[PDB]
Amino acid sequence: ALSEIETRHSEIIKLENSIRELHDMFMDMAMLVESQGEMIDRIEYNVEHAVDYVERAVSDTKKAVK
Amino acid sequence: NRRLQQTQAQVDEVVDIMRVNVDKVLERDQKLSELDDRADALQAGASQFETSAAKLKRKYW
Amino acid sequence: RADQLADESLESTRRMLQLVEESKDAGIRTLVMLDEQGEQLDRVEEGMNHINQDMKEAEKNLKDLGKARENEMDENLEQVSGIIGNLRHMALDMGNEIDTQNRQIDRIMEKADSNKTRIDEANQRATKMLG
Amino acid sequence: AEAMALLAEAERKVKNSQSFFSGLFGGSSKIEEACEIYARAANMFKMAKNWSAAGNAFCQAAQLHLQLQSKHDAATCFVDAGNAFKKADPQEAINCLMRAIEIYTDMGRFTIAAKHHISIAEIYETELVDVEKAIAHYEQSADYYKGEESNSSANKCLLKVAGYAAQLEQYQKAIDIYEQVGTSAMDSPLLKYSAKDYFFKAALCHFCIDMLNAKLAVQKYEELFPAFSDSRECKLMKKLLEAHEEQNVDSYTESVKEYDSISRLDQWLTTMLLRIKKTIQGDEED
Amino acid sequence: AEAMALLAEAERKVKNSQSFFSGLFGGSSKIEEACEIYARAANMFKMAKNWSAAGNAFCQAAQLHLQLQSKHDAATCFVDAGNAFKKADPQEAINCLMRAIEIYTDMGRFTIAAKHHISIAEIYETELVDVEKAIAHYEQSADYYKGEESNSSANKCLLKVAGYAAQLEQYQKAIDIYEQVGTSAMDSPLLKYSAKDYFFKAALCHFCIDMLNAKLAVQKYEELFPAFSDSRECKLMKKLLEAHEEQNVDSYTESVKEYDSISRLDQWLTTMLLRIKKTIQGDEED
Amino acid sequence: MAGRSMQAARCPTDELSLSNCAVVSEKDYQSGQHVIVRTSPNHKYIFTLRTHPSVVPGSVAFSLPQRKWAGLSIGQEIEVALYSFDKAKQCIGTMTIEIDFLQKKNIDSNPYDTDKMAAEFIQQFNNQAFSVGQQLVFSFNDKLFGLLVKDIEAMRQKIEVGLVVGNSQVA
Amino acid sequence: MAGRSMQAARCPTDELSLSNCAVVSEKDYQSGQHVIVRTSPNHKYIFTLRTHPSVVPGSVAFSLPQRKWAGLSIGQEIEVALYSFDKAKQCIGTMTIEIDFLQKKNIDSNPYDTDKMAAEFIQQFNNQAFSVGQQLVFSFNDKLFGLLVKDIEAMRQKIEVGLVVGNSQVA
Incomplete structure (x- = not known):
């Protein structure tokens, strides 16, 4: 009976639908997580060293009061 | 229709978590960028602190 | 078109199995990357608590200084459904690894601007009593 | 705690001293004191949401800061001013940011210069509606990102450049940008995924090219039958290329109608697709 | 504001003082001046798109800085120089980085040392095409990552090492690397899924062994049957192991053609599978 | 030059x-x-x-x-x-061409006299260069076709590209 | 001028x-x-x-x-x-036109009433210049045609170019 085989169909496509769109979000995600990764590399970097320069600044201030 | 409707929403429910993932992951991107403008702006003054702390070294040491 | 709909929609579920498989692997990178990001921040805080101290001392030192078709079909979909187990292993952990860090990042930005100010003041009070 | 009062005090102290008030030494602490004043005013202005009064206030404090000897925190103030005017009712948001970048740039701070540069081009488009200059900024900024080996941001910006370039008839310059952003994308197996859409966009963009500029760029693509991600990129393209080489505005309009079942058509694609639809109809009754 | 002028003044000042110029004290306070000079010039050079000049300028400011006793700000500058030469036209983009690591390493900053170490082995391969030194770096770098319990980056690098090692005919040393990276990946349930491909590679890699080194590696693999993931690993391998132990290069070349469906074969696989497709034929006509 | x-x-x-x-x-x-x-x-x-x-x-x-x-x-x-071209050993004397309706949309079962074709082909493509495997379109009676050079022989040696002349036979 | x-x-x-x-x-x-x-x-x-x-x-x-x-x-x-135009020797009174279908894509040939065609022909192509052998397109019932002036007669002398008026019959 087509009324039964046709019903199955409409349900599978509408299933395929919601699918591909969701998967789209997975892709964009990996694309977003990446951009953020390279941006944090510069953050930590500038911060890490920022602590190195200050570490030398404080070491001098301490020896500037003795 | 059995396995159909079964696997049907099985993903419609996975379509939600990503809606949360894409957002929670994008909200961070902007917050980190905010720290990139302050953290650097900080050391920017550190360049002054080092020199300033040195000028104090040649006055009391 | 029975067989033309039970196969095309199935042909997609097959092109769908890998999809979530491809997104799962792509998601794994988010796992290893958000794990690396969490580590590289543990040191940031370390350097943030490092500056917090030194400044407090410096400031004080300056004061002291101033003064079988469906059987397989299902298996292909089951794999897509099982992947949720991996999709769960991601959104969760990192999803929470997001809060902990963000709440920490703000505490990092503040102190970051805090030390900055105390440096401008220290410099001003220092200039007036320079060589 | 009154802004008007502060603004007045600030003005009263922001002036190079001489004669009896000077004594011997000037006083950068004065100009800076005034800065703190204006800042304090701009703050309460932003509090009551008068923005137009906050922004112009920051400007003052910012300008004065320069008269001190602190370009850094000053530029950051210019940013506060830009953020104010942006979320305000007047303009000036463009001037403040230009005044901010001149500082980050001359200071040796390109990372940040570009961070505000993209914001700028984003304003000159979503607000002033001046894409011709916006693209110019999206580009120079992508160049700065490309200098900091920050492939990511560089590509984001390039994508903006080409994206709006196609909308400004610049179809060729668009494919070129897509080619570059595509070549410097395969190197990293992290972009392999999205690397499709680039080829689809590029192949779609046509500088009125009367040939197979795309049919040559469609085969250049490395598609794979089993690769299902690919079925969402060139597979359609080929079918569109035949529908154009035969002036059949029916096979193309049908293939796009079918493709809108497996892969939804975003606003962009839609616009360009109809542009090609016209190149076809137009070549029929033209 | 002229770089050409600054480069001159910097030189005129970079020189161990003496006589009247030295007065009572001096040295670092003078060399540092020339340092920020060259940096100031390198900036405008990078502004005028003269990169080359910018890089050589940073090289100057850098070397001088070392002549002041501040390896830290120095190495960072060397990196800036590398960033210049890289996105420039000359070379030395490899020299600056080495000069940076020699500093980050002896200084103790292995974390960041490996951070640039991988960038190095990445350029020595995508550019200089010096796989020999490339592997050496990818490796030592992974050793550093392994020291900072950064299992993650460590394996990323190991994967590079083995990956390119199988290309240099180092099949055996490759499978060994895959075994190590495999034993240090099961401890982390955050990698179990990917752990398959490792065994697939290690089993595909053949150091001209005619035995069943692979039939033993495929057995060492832990798989059940209803594994959604495991379908992309050994299942094929066995079929490949049988197509070899029967000198039938027709079932192997067919299995690679079929498997190429459920899982698209990337470059690597193709090359090795061809090196396996040849051994059989060579075992036939022999 | x-x-x-x-x-x-x-x-x-x-x-x-x-x-x-x-x-x-x-x-x-x-x-x-x-x-x-x-x-x-x-x-x-x-x-x-x-x-x-x-x-x-x-x-x-x-x-x-x-x-x-x-x-x-x-x-x-x-x-x-x-x-x-070196007309000494490059001139075409016998060149076979694979003809087929360029556009499979206007395909018909009508008869097409070849003699009339080999006459116009040399009357419009004379003193020109042709290569083996070269793709071109032949306009015969306002009808477009797809010519596909299969083999080329000089006046017997095989050559990739040749120079069609007046006394050139086309099949 | x-x-x-x-x-x-x-x-x-x-x-x-x-x-x-x-x-x-x-x-x-x-x-x-x-x-x-x-x-x-x-x-x-x-x-x-x-x-x-x-x-x-x-x-x-x-x-x-x-x-x-x-x-x-x-x-x-x-x-x-x-x-x-000289409305004394260029006035079209009987202009024959070879009518064919411009596009061979659409294929519908209902009984196109010529009377209705000549009615809409002059209602859109009135007070215009037409020459012998001129090519143009005709819109009849959302259909595109391929007209071709074969001969033009004034209100019998044959003219190369004329001016279609309101009382201009078309065949």
């Missing part, structure tokens, strides 16, 4: 796009000369020139088929140099 | 394309006047002008059918000159 940089373009009219001739300007070359298009160290082709008052100096126009064969691009840079 | 240089352009809208009229600017000519395009000593063509707020001053736009007839190209320099 030694080679000059040009710019690929589109065939002026439709009548020339049926002669399989590289339409050029009268301020550069003339009608009858031969050239060798270069696009890569491993991509060399040979075409025939046919001037037209609608060609801009410093650019060679090609039809759709030609672009589908030589894989050329309207806008890219291509090197063109004069080429002289 | 002495003749001025113009530049061939592309028809603005489609409505002016089915009117078979040379669209011009309101800053040059006026709707209703006739002109004679000159491309060479032995090539004079007459068209009907129809201004439009899109035409650029110093250029005349022609449709595809007109360009394929008068042999005009997009970007050529021509000379236009006003032309006044």
